[PDB]
Structures are given as C-alpha cells and as structure tokens.
Design a protein around this nucleic acid. Structure first.
Ligand code: ZN
Lengths: 101, 136, 213, 67, 83, 25
RNA sequence: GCGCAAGACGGACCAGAGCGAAAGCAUUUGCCAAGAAUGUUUUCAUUAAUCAAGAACGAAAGUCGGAGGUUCGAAGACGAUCAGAUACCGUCGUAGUUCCGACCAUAAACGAUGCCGACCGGCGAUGCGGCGGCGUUAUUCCCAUGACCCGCCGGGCAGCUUCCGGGAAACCAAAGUCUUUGGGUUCCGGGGGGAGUAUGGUUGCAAAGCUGAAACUUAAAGGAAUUUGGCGAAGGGCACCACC
C-alpha cells in the first residue's frame, strides 16, 4: 500500500543528497528527509532576566540570543513528541500550526 | 594580593568561562588577557555523588565558590563566556549554565558583555557512533 | 597548600591614540625572579575588547585584538592585531531564502604589515516585492565578488595600518560597497567580518610611540 | 547559605488550575498590598477563596508545573 | 468551449499564440532599415542580426548581437518596411 | 524467515561445497 | 590563552531548487572541453524510432602494490545491564575510511511504474531564455541596460482541484483515449515451495556475477479496503470496587 503523494522527503529530481547527523541520535538520515528546527532561545528566558538586567553595569543593555539549529531522526523526533500523527482526511495539510508566542 | 583599584570610583572587569555540558559543569575565571587564571571550580567538588554532576545545585555551589573567591580577591565585574560542549557533539547547552549565571547574579557581582564562545566547526569529522545511531 | 598571591603584581595597559578610551582593564602577573623576568610574560598577550569600551556612544558589536609590544614599568603599550564581529550578529544575519556572498584578498599594506580582510554580503528584499525567493545568478555573484575584492584591496594597499583602521572604525568600506554594488542587484548588509594579520615588520619603538601620540 | 527573607503579605485575586502529580497543588495568583506592582505564582494546599489574604515568608522563586 | 470556431478568430488570438500553433503559418520577425545620423547611405538589416554589422563606408558600427532582437546604436532613425 | 542471513549461510555452505569438491580429488 | 604539525570535510547560506544517461555533484580563483532550452525569412534534405551481436560508464563493501593514515569504526580485548548476552551501553582496538594505480559488475541502483509520437480541462506558483506593458532604483532629462511589478511564449521537476476518463481499491491528468478490443517497437510472467538450488558453460588471481534444472509435497500462498478488537502508540474524560 502506497502511503503518500510524494516519497516522504524533498527528493524529486536528484536521486541522492548529502547525509546529515541527528542530535540526540546519530542516524545518517538524508537532509531532505529529516526534521529541522530553527529555534531561538535567549540566554535567560523568564527565570532571572530582571536579576541579570539589574546586575548589568552598562545602561540599556539587552541580552543576546542563541541561534542554533538541530537535526532529528524520525524515531528521535517522534519519541520527543516533536511531530504528531494524524488522520488520512487531513494528511494533506502542509500548513504549519499558527504562531503566537 | 590586593588591587590598587578603588571601590568607590569604578569596578574592575574580568572574564569568566562557563563550560556546561549535559553531564558536567566547569566554572573558570581568568584575567582579561586570558593568560593567567584566578580560581576554578567544577560541579562535583563538595557533592561526591556522580548523579549531581549536572544539577542546578552543583552549579549554584560552584558560582558561590567563585563569588567568595572573587569577593576576597576584589574582582567585581565579569564577562560571562558560555560554552556548551565543544566540537561536533551537540550545540545546545544544558540547564546548569542558567543556574550558574543566576547564582552569580544572586550573590551580588556585576556583569558586562555576555556572549557564546562555543567552538563551532565548519564541519568536523565522523561523529562518535555508527550509521544507525546511538539507539537504546 | 599555600596561596601564590603574595607573588602577584598588578600592571595596566594603554590603548593607542587610534582609539578614544585609554584604559581597558588590568592584568595580574607574578614578580621577577632574575631567571624568570616578567617582561616577556607581558609580551605574548592578546586582549579581547568591544567597541563601546574604546570609542564613544554608538552601536557596539565588534571586537578588536590588541597585542602588547614593549613594557618599561607600571604600563604597557599595545597595537592592532585583528578585528572580528559578534557571533550572535553573524548567526542572526543569516536569513532563510537569502543568499550570502563572501570574498578575501591577502592584501599587503605600505609597510610590512600583511592583513587578510574578510567580507560578507546579503541581498536586499524590496518593499514592492511579492516573490519570496529572491536569489541571484552565479555570474552576478562572481562579478559582485570581483568588485568587492578590487574595492577592498584598493583601500588597504595605498595606506598604512593607522589610516585604514581609522577608516575602519566607521563603516566607510561598507558604505563604498553598498554604494558601488547596488547597480547590479540591491544588497543591504555588508560588514567586514574578520581581519586577520599574518606577518609584521622588524620590531621598533617609534611606531609604537606614534600610535599612542 | 546566609539569606534573609523579610515578612511579605499577599492577597489572592485569581486562581489558576489545580496541578500536581496526584492532582492536589493549586496554582494561585496573588497581589501584594505592600506594593501594587508585584504578583507571583506558587503552590498552595488548602481551600482558597478569591479575595482572601495569604501568608508568605520568602518570595524570590516561582513554581514549576508538576516536577 | 463547446462550439469553438477555429476558422477565423480575432487577430489577438493569433498574436498571443506561438508562431507554429498559429493556424495560418507565418513568423513574427521582420526586416528593417536604419541609417547613421552623420551619413547619407542607409542599409537594411534583419531584426535578429546574430553578427555585428557596421554601416557602409566603414564609419560607425550599427547593431549588436543579442539573444533576441538586435539592439540599435543610440540616436538612429528607422521605420518598419512591409509589403 | 528473512532472505539476507539465509542467503549468507547458504552462500557459506555453497563455499564449503565448492572447497570440498576442489579438494575431493 | 598563544604558536607549530598532520589528515579529513566543506555546515548555517541549501529550498518539494539546479545540472548530468545513471551511479552522483556545494571554499574562492585560473585553464581546457562538452551540452539542454531559448531566438532565427541560415544551411544538408528523409539523414527517422526502438534495438538480439558487441561496447562505454557505474554508490558502498570486497582483493592485489605503494607514501601516508586525524576522527569514526567490522572481527577482537576489557567492565556494567541480564535467570542466561559471546546483544543494546561505555573504553581501547586490526583490516578498512582519504590519494595514485589493477579488478567483479552487485543495491529498496524503486518514481517498486520501458522509449518515441498524437490528443483530451482549469487554477496559482518556481527555474531558464525571449517578448510587450504603469510606476520606482545607478546625482534629479533620454536610451538600452541589473533589479521591482503586470501579462504572453517553449522545454523540465511540480502543487491544488475536477463523477472527462480509468482501476479490485488504494490512487492516476496518466496507471486515460480498451469487448465501441489493432500507432511503432525492445525486454519480460503463468498457484505456492523446492530454488536463483545441483550439474554444465562462462568471466574472475579473489569473493562471486551471468546462464539456469529435476524428483517430491502442497490448496492455498498473496493484493486492496470495512466492522469492536489488540497495542511498553498518541490525544481527551471518568471511578474512593483508583489515588491524594
Ligand atoms: Zn534522533
């Protein structure tokens, strides 16, 4: 039984792409098949941001962020509840969930 | 053993490295040039249990040790230099760096520019493991 | 066992007149024991700073490498060694669905100072644009890289280190880059990301005194 | 550890849902009357009606969800 | 369309279509003539030159080879001829 | 019963039969 | 933290994007050679399509000779896990991994769908080249130039929808134009095991690659989808025969 419209990745005219490595795993999943994440994280999220700011010598100093990205294998991503399964009638929904915060 | 800088005029500025992996926490402090050090402390200094090597309490105790050492030496303002693991293993640091920095800010020191000095490669050699991964 | 802070001196360095703020920090070297002089121990030192610690009130996300050259007692004289941006700014300016252009020329100055200037460039998305892709062809990037290398190697080979640094404290090379490269494809973000030094001439003292005034 | 905790008083206004491993810890939103600018969220075990004064001895850290 | 008449549509319909999908078969390019502003002799040139051409008398080059139609030298008067 | 290790073991017995037929003279 | 030295690789930029017959291909620069598409009122004039013989290329792993081999890492060595592990896990670790030659021609080398050519609907996008048309950007006026926008043309990866139509259904704008059955052409299969097995030939130093049985047993082996199952699957709600 064929499952999807595509083959499950972003290979449609190439045949082979470069392999990448997972973060919590080490599987050599291809780049067009894996799951990426462009996460933005501050140095202090909500824990002691006022304690950091009031201890700062420089007036009007803003904390920087950490723009790092991670690569997940499919089993590693489904174990960490990153992606979730759904039904067949809504499986053709490429649109991401909405962003608010 | 004592510095000629006055505690009423301005504050001195050193740099301190924090290396915070998923199972180890280093808190090291050196001079501004980085040639010579001041003191150093790991997570597993007083807590002899291995399981607390990556814990908020060990990082908090390490930051208190740096706090007491820098207060008896007279070092007030610090630049925090954060390192996650180094190399091609991971990129996101653990939760020990957060507790170490908030315990440094809790004691009473002053902070300046903070940044990340993680040795990011262009791309390194083969990762420690196999093709199928570190399954468990 | 015993604290060696009894044998611990306290020295200070001085920024050149090419900057504005003279004092940047302090160092803690040990004493002199005849066979172990502390004069050479102050030689091999690189000081890491920011822009607001040296110049006046403007934006500050750049770093400067400062290496000492000679000491005579209770003071140190330094000089330019390298320049670099912030890693946070570098990893923030990398945008998805935008291309990046880089170039380098090992350009030699008037004196024996040899540098290695790096450059980076990102294209500009227009306000009228509806297409989200906004890429450029390979020959466009090649000609942009050729113009960038020629402009960057023209401004360094004609002058000494102090003049090109004083041109490098504001954005003059970058202002020339988005002045001259917008005729082929509009780009908005060019910083000199890193300047690496390779070789120096014979060591002297008049240059070291004249960079401080 | 040499920390001092001054006596500060709180008064609840809104109550959030009831958390915990077995489901007994209650998340509440307090409002100080020493100053009308600081509100902290903690865990309380017991009946709390909205608009009732609450006792505190230390206030520097918030509360997690379950563990 | 059901009863789409392909005998004689509007000329815009044959204009928008391809040169070979057109039901009466005819190309789109044409012949032209153009002179030099400081000369008397005027010569003819095809719309797609594919070689660089100069006007007679060996005074000033006239056209330039492009992927499409040949672009003319600035400041030259011309008109399309037809028969 | 999958085909890979079945084919591997049966290739091993193929090689054993080949060497036995070689040295059977 | 500062220098020296070796080897490997070129992240983020990198996309349901490009190129190539496929296997495959990402630091800049310099040289050589080839090619799709676009445009053409240029030239030869049937040079055409598919192909038994035969031929080229071909991921990794494998064998023969070398300088040199960072990191990772078959077989193996040492500890914990385990009723029992010579498995998962950790530390070392040889052959290998990279380069120059010499070879076998095997993958889920899969779009599990041969090539050419004609036809049958739409929508909005991206990539190349050409084309027409408001208005902005390279010291304020024109021109074509690079970019922005609105439409058209040809080829390619495509996406959405469609009682066109097809199919056992999954699904397909081809897997359609088929009992209303014939466009041209190459390879290839008749219930399931035995068995890609033995023999024979063939190539190879080497592993094996190609070719390819018989006896006997067997009435099922298989493909699609539905109904409550049953999940150390996910997500909601309830119970003091559950908990606080
Ligand atoms: Zn994983």
């Amino acid at each position: 039984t064929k499952k999807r419209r595509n083959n499950g990745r972003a290979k449609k005219g190439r045949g082979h792409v470069q392999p990448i490595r997972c973060t919590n795993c080490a599987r050599c999943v291809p780049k067009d098949k894996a799951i990426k994440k462009f996460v933005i994280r501050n140095i202090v999220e909500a824990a002691a941001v006022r304690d950091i700011s009031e201890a700062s010598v420089f007036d009007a100093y803003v904390l920087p962020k950490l723009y790092v990205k991670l690569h997940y294998c499919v089993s590693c991503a489904i174990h960490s509840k990153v992606v979730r399964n759904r039904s067949r009638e809504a499986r053709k929904d490429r649109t991401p969930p909405p962003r608010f915060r | 053993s004592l510095g000629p800088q006055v505690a009423e005029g301005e504050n001195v500025f050193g740099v301190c490295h924090i290396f915070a992996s998923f199972n180890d926490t280093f808190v090291h402090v050196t001079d501004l040039s980085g040639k010579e050090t001041i003191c150093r402390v790991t997570g597993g200094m007083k807590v002899k249990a291995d399981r607390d090597e990556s814990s908020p309490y060990a990082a908090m105790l390490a930051a208190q040790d740096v706090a007491q050492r820098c207060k008896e030496l007279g070092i007030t303002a610090l630049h925090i230099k954060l390192r996650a693991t180094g190399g091609n293993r991971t990129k996101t640091p653990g939760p020990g760096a957060q507790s170490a920095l908030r315990a440094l800010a809790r004691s009473g020191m002053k902070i300046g520019r903070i940044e990340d000095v993680t040795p990011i490669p262009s791309d390194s050699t083969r990762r420690k493991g196999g093709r199928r991964g570190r399954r468990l | 066992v015993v604290d060696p802070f009894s044998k611990k001196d306290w020295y200070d360095v001085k920024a050149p007149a090419m900057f504005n703020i003279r004092n940047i920090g302090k160092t803690l070297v040990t004493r002199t024991q005849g066979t172990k002089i502390a004069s050479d121990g102050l030689k091999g030192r690189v000081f890491e700073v920011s822009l607001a610690d040296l110049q006046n009130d403007e934006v500050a996300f750049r770093k400067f490498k400062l290496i000492t050259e000679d000491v005579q007692g209770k003071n140190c004289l330094t000089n330019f060694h390298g320049m670099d941006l912030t890693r946070d700014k570098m990893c923030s300016m990398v945008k998805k669905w935008q291309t990046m252009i880089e170039a380098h020329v090992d350009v030699k100055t008037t004196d024996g100072y040899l540098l290695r200037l790096f450059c980076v460039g990102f294209t500009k998305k227009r306000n009228n644009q509806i297409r989200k892709t906004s890429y450029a062809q390979h020959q466009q990037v090649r000609q942009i890289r050729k113009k960038m290398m020629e402009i960057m190697t023209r401004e360094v080979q004609t002058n000494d280190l102090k003049e090109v640094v004083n041109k490098l404290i504001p954005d003059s090379i970058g202002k020339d880059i988005e002045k001259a490269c917008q005729s082929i494809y509009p780009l908005h973000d060019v910083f000199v990301r890193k300047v690496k030094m390779l070789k120096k001439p014979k060591f002297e003292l008049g240059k070291l005194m004249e960079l401080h005034g | 550890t040499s920390r001092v905790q001054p006596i500060k008083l709180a008064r609840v206004t809104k109550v959030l849902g009831r958390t915990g491993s077995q489901g007994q810890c209650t998340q509440v939103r307090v409002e100080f009357m020493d100053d009308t600018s600081r509100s902290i969220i903690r865990n309380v075990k017991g009946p709390v009606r909205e608009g009732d004064v609450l006792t505190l001895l230390e206030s520097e850290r918030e509360a997690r969800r379950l563990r | 369309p059901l009863a789409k008449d392909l005998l004689h549509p509007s000329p815009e319909e044959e204009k928008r279509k391809h040169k070979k999908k057109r039901l009466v078969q005819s190309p789109n390019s044409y012949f032209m003539d153009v002179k030099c502003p400081g000369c008397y002799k005027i010569t003819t040139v095809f719309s797609h030159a594919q070689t660089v051409v100069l006007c007679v008398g060996c005074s000033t080059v006239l056209c330039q080879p492009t992927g499409g139609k040949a672009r003319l030298t600035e400041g030259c008067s011309f008109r399309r001829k037809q028969h | 019963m999958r085909a890979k290790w079945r084919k591997k073991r049966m290739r091993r017995l193929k090689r054993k039969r080949r060497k036995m037929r070689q040295r059977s003279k």
